[model samples]
Target: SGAIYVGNYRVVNRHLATHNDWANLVWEDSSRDLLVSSTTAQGCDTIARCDCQTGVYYCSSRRKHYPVSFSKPSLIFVEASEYYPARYQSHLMLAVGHSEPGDCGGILRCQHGVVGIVSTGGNGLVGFADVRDLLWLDE
Candidate 1:
């Protein structure tokens, strides 16, 4: 059935109909470990370690469910360190969504779609590039 951002309404509709594949994009507030959970049958519930990456965990299953049902799960830190160099600045926000399953860990919530490679820079220059070249674009 592909994905919503990848194909037309028909594809996403078909994908949701069949339980063939289930992919979830997840995110977390802090680096601490998380226990993901889902409502189970009977009066009991289920919980699992949200650990998906090396040394990184999703914090909890309930958090994972929110994004699936609500569609926009957010992650944030109470207070963050603000020290940085003048050459560049890193931005922090109150939401993380994990979409891809791979080596890099950024946003925790997973989104179903296909995206072209692009970048957002404070310098106001914006454009699209090959996904393979994104790592070298800034350099």
Candidate 2:
């Protein structure tokens, strides 16, 4: 069993029993690639607030950061979607980890944000990823 604290968010994984390797869902600010919407129903879950004075927070289902920007920033609309399954619902926080480019463990310039939506083959939207890409399958 492995338990780690990512800010106020507590992540406990049974490792072998469940493939809850926290490192997999990690993603960084890949070109500030975040999701945002004008409608109130489009917002996702808030992960955490930015410490950089950007007045931003990380979102779960959609935007990577909240208080997004001038055109898309939301000061109070950051709420979780009711459409998101109850089993998949959780409070989130931001975290960063280091990994080598290859198996050789080189410079370790790579970074990722520790976020994910794990599916138990239960229902709703499911997602998966490999070394290079992320794929989502909803049925």
Candidate 3:
């Protein structure tokens, strides 16, 4: 599958199948470097970094805790950065999902489908970009 760089995270395809098929997305929380097995007081799990020495490893979950997944993921991060000043913006940092993939074959795109960003309590955005169209894009 393809991936899109949004803010400080990289949204990747996590095509998961449910009763009606779901477009799952995934991203890494670089801020979390510890291995946490238990959830916080809010009863939500934590996104931790992989630390093999302490049995810490990369983990994933459903849309309720991650970014929206997409078959043909097509989106771009529009924000103010020193590197890409050509596309600089002083407004609220936002990621605009589009239908066109442009030059990058990494944005999420779904034919006759919808895209969504999952709410992960600020850990990361995880959800489904496509819910019906299952033609399947990249692996």
Candidate 4:
């Protein structure tokens, strides 16, 4: 039930019943943390031009913007990995990685392109959903 439009023209992207609540995978771990999605993705436009499972890349985020609002500098670093929980469905296999201190929803990118968004660091890592799948879904 999400919509993607460029300026005023909506792009063709649809979520199946499966993709429904797909974002829940982002927070399926931290009961304390919540997933926040917005129609206007304000800051970053850089996304992973390709998918990667190896090599290092940078991850970045402001950490927090008052329940309220604000921005800060960043703590940057790079690492990579993906999770495949034996018990969960493939839909939940988020892009796991390491980075400098950052809050959830941070953007992960490389010299080539983006990897995904960081879910959190409690897993001793990040739980990000791949943005690639969202790139193509037309009829």
Most TM-score-accurate candidate: 4
Q: Which candidate number would show the highest lDDT if scored against the true structure?
A: 4
Number of backbone-clashing residue pairs for each candidate, in the order shown: 24, 3, 20, 2
Error of 2 at 35 (Å): 29
RMSD of each: 18.2, 17.8, 17.6, 12.1
Candidate 1 per-residue lDDT over residues 16-131, each given as its tens digit: 22332223222111222111111122221111112121111132212332221111112322222221122221122121333321211112222321111111112322111111
Worst 10 residues of 3 by lDDT: 30-39
State candidate 1's TM-score. 0.17
Model 4 clash tally, residue pairs: 2
Model 2 regions lying over 4 Å from their true place: 1-12, 15-112, 117-119, 127-139
Tally clashes: model 3. Answer: 20
Q: How do these models rank on lDDT, best leading?
A: 4, 3, 2, 1
What's the TM-score of each model vs. the native? Answer: 0.17, 0.15, 0.17, 0.36
Candidate 2 at residue 70, lDDT?
15
Question: Tens-digit lDDT track for model 2 on 6-61?
Answer: 33232222112123333334332211222111222222223322222113322233
